Amino acid sequence: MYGWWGRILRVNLTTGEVKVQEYPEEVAKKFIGGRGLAAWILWNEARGVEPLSPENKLIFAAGPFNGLPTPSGGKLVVAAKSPLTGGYGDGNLGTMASVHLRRAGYDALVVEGKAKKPVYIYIEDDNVSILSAEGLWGKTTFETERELKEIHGKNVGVLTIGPAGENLVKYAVVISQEGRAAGRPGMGAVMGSKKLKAVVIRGTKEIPVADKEELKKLSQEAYNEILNSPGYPFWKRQGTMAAVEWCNTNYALPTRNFSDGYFEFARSIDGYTMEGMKVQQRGCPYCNMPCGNVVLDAEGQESELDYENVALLGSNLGIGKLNEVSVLNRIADEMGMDTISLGVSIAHVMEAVERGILKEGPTFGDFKGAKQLALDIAYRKGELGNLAAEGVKAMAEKLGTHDFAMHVKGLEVSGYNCYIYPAMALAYGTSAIGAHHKEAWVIAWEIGTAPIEYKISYDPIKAQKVVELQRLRGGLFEMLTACRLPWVEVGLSLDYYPKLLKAITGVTYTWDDLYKAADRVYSLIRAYWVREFNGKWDRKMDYPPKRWFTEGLKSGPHKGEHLDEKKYDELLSEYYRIRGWDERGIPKKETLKELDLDFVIPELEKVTNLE
Amino acid sequence: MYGWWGRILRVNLTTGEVKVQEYPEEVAKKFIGGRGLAAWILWNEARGVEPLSPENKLIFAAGPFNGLPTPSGGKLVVAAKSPLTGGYGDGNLGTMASVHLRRAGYDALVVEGKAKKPVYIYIEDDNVSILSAEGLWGKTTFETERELKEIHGKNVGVLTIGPAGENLVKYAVVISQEGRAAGRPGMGAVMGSKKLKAVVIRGTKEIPVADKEELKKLSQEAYNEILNSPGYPFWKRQGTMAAVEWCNTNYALPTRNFSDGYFEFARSIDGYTMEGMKVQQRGCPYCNMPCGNVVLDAEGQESELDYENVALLGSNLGIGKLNEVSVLNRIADEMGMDTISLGVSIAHVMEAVERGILKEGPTFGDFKGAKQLALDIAYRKGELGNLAAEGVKAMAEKLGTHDFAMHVKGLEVSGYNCYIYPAMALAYGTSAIGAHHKEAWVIAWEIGTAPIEYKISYDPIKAQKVVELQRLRGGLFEMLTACRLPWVEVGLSLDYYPKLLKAITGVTYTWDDLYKAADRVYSLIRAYWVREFNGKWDRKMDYPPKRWFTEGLKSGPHKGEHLDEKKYDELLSEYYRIRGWDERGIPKKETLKELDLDFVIPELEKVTNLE
């Protein structure tokens, strides 16, 4: 076997047992890695488990591209049954831990059980130990990684959780290298529930490559193509922050809990403003187009800015000064909580306060109040911090505020306001893990323009475009696993991927093979949700928030415009037709058989009727 | 088996293999623990090795008293073939590592081999790992322990080496809890030679004891006997520092490389001065008479003062301000170098400089110059610092200054100047590990008074006294292994010891059994020296420094007086007569047989003729 090790590191925190599981080359070829491998593991090992119980499996899954010098191939997938959504949950982050896990001889790391006290997992090739982290517990993510490196050396990959993870904030994430984050659906809370403070990894092994020279050649070509792309200069300057102006121009910038798609103060929180306050730039392993832009916040502290962070903690909160939004951003990284769900939870509180629903709490534009709430959420201080720490779905159940609860499947909607964007609304509605733009950022195509540089339509071809994008963004890139931005942003040819894959693994994958592996992952993931939800499931699970159907844009040429539910419903049926799912969004028996998921049928039938 | 576990933790840094060695209860009964067990291990496993080579064995040996709540029972022996003397070397320190090692299920820890890069050993009960210490290398002992606890928590025992150990200073030691030190004969250099930066230990097991109720009863009585002793109040005030005035009054205070036994500025570095500058008091585990007296030095830094540190870095260097001596003391602790050998080496340089033998270097009374040289020794910076880092024996050979090289067997003489004290000179001459007062502080008995509160003689009875004290101090207390101070200083009855040993192990030891066990250890150690010296050995190996014969006291009523060679030689023969050793200081065959050391005979016969 080349590329894949066929090895998965297993750590049981309850028993202290550490072992290496060998999985068949057939499974590796069939699921490829990252999310695929994770979905296979969770389907088999997390049936009916409580997300915060010792039985949940915390998975760190790499893929064949990882550990090797592949173009922006320093990504890693973190997965577990989600404490926020109750379904399959995952996330991705660039981190040296990805390079080291693979160079240490493993394709993935699976943590089960729960330690008796705070501990961290140490991995140096074949030497794996569960060590006491009593001294680290309570420290920020930044401080935890800094201290671990002060002991073991700079040459290690470190994954940590901060107080939000330790306190089981439902959208707590895993942090690496002060800025890289993974696991919006609460991977950080699953990590915290096991009393797992960090993971330190070092690898030195040579990963067996089927064609060393092709690999080295293809990689050099791709790097050069990136360096020579016309978008490279502007990408180097603004990175994802170029989307603030682009979204504002197109009425897609979430403003005041998604109330409007335009923000009057977007310029003072945009990419140009960011350029003027940038002090450093860093990136993920093996990437020659770094986009981790670091600024100084209002308190003079370094903060790494990404578009989503700014959109959800800036315009979405009615906060118009980038230096202030940057303080909130830093807090999220330090505490280890998702900037998106954090911002949407805060915005939800702000709307409830302005409406008189909540007697106390911050209002839109209130930076000091937003900062205090962010901190109270991470430390679960007071009734408000505790409520908001649960996310908008849970919070809305308690407050009767479902009308303005911006989420899909319990996962908070990200940085694109879709009052007039049917395809993007469908992307959020059908995202495998819950509302996220990860799997299909189709709004650009719907508009005809993109950040590096209108008539509302429900054409069934939009459902086809979303499935196509999900195959690449929610499948391929989450399985390799590698950054999708070189392709998305600078236009690196997708042809490099199946070639790099054969050069590495020696297996020839055609685009249809890849499209099929991605579809298998999608149906398996959906199957997981259906099974864990005990068959209680229908098409409404794939609907975007009610706000986009009952309210419209508040300003500009498109004022009053919104989504037509009837037409959205028809577009959803088209999505199901293309995926081979029934009108409830559940995979059909024939579809499962065709995707080599026969094993799913018996289990799903114990819970509902299949078609 | 009670008391002893009969288990030794084994760590091979070259191969990375960790295993547990079981040894018979008969060996445990025979050698008891600590130095006894260490001597057994070195005899069998450090045969013909280079002290700084991977084959040398670094031993951390505890005894049956350790890990249990025994009066001042938190001591630990650190042993290995010495890079300073070439013979058997060991030292002792109080440390929570002692409590933890034994509660983790081990009687001792033996480290062999050499790591490719800096590492530290982590022990938590049965979970043992070799971890990267690449970020730690180069840090002071204080900072190393502090950082390790910032990761693993406060409930651990830690042993570290500082830059002096890393740089292989010949008298580098192992440090714990910013003040406790062990291994004057270079144990820190052996540790540094293996690229072992630290040992972190945690133990939670219940150590099996034969009679828990009697152990509890005896310990409470002993603790109360200490509290209620007439010497307790003055001890709590001055600790070992009371010896500065006592030695000065009796012309035993090493002054200017032992040139005199009287120092004109002794009051300014004495116990009363120490009391006026004490800011804290620390101690070893399970001790109710803590003696780690912490003062602020001339630089406002904390420094724990012990008599020897002050005598050898103060009066011995012509430095009369305690705050300045405390700066040197702190450097010795931070760097991890023996204060005694450091001071004697610096003192040697000062005399050579003032005699014009050395053209560059500090002179007596030169604090600034002494500080710079101490730092240069730790970092092996320059010709002078590298030379002094070798110790006086090696340094004297190069400079041809043997006439004033104060050492015995290559270990520098400690804090008692013996121009007029034959028994104490015999104590230094016959000390099992080289010049040290550890095994027999007979000078107090020789004069008739003690710090806690004369006509020179060579009576044969003085050799008997030295043997008796060696049995207790170099044997019993190094085997239990427990602090000898409660007995020496406040008069704790020695009768508690055999009784406590019985309550713990279930085995009865009469005083004759203990004397025999101690004599067995003394002959096995002497046999190790002879064998490692390839048979090149004679009575002059047990001679005190030449200066005590060729010069006399420079002050007071005893001005001009010194030791007589012929008379000392007869006293030494009396010592051998009592020990059953021949006129070359080598154990006789019948003595070895009597002490159950038959196995030693064949090995000694390959290098010399036995009697």
Ligand code: SF4
């Ligand atoms: S483009 Fe940005 S997110 Fe992608 S690998 Fe490079 S630094 Fe990481």
Ligand code: SF4
């Ligand atoms: S008397 Fe001093 S050296 Fe002995 S155990 Fe107590 S604190 Fe340690």
